[PDB]
């Protein structure tokens, strides 16, 4: 069992069996503690960096949860989807992806199209709801 980012160098096949270790730590931090001891201490130099490090922790959590809500993947760690790969984004085989790459290299090849894959993902979930409202 690995720790935080402990399988970042392992291939995508074996780095995907430890997704929970990097997922438990998107909000939990030391910053929720108050201080060594409790003028206007909420304005001290060390007391302003701690206020903006709580808003940063919240915002960085929502920008990834906002996308999950739109794609219909809320409450799931691994989420299947009805969006087919066109191979224009990447024309590699199945073995060359899950047995020959780490997650960092993969996210660099498709860094062109993530702005477009997100829009395709959103439209597909929207088209699931319209196709279900006018069907039941």
């Amino acid at each position: 069992i690995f720790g935080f980012l402990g399988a970042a160098g392992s291939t995508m096949g074996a780095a995907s069996n430890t997704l929970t270790v990097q997922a438990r730590q998107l909000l939990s931090g030391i910053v929720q503690q108050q201080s060594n001891l409790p003028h206007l201490l909420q304005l001290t130099v060390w007391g302003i960096k701690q206020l903006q490090a709580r808003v940063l922790a919240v915002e960085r959590y929502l920008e990834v949860q906002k996308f999950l809500g739109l794609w219909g993947c809320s409450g799931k760690i691994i989420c299947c989807t009805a969006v087919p790969w066109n191979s224009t984004w990447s024309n590699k085989s199945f073995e060359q992806i899950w047995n020959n790459m780490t997650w960092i290299e993969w996210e660099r090849e498709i860094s062109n199209y993530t702005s477009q894959i997100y829009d395709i993902l959103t439209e597909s979930q929207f088209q699931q709801d319209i196709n279900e409202v006018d069907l039941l």
């Binding site: 402990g6 997704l19 990834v64 999950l68 691994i78 191979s87 960092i104 993902l121």
Partner: peptide, 16 residues
């Protein structure tokens, strides 16, 4: 192949 579909993984070890 022709049976490839987009799958979202949450928590992958990537950084910038």
């Amino acid at each position: 192949a022709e049976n490839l579909w987009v799958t979202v993984y949450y928590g992958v070890p990537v950084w910038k």
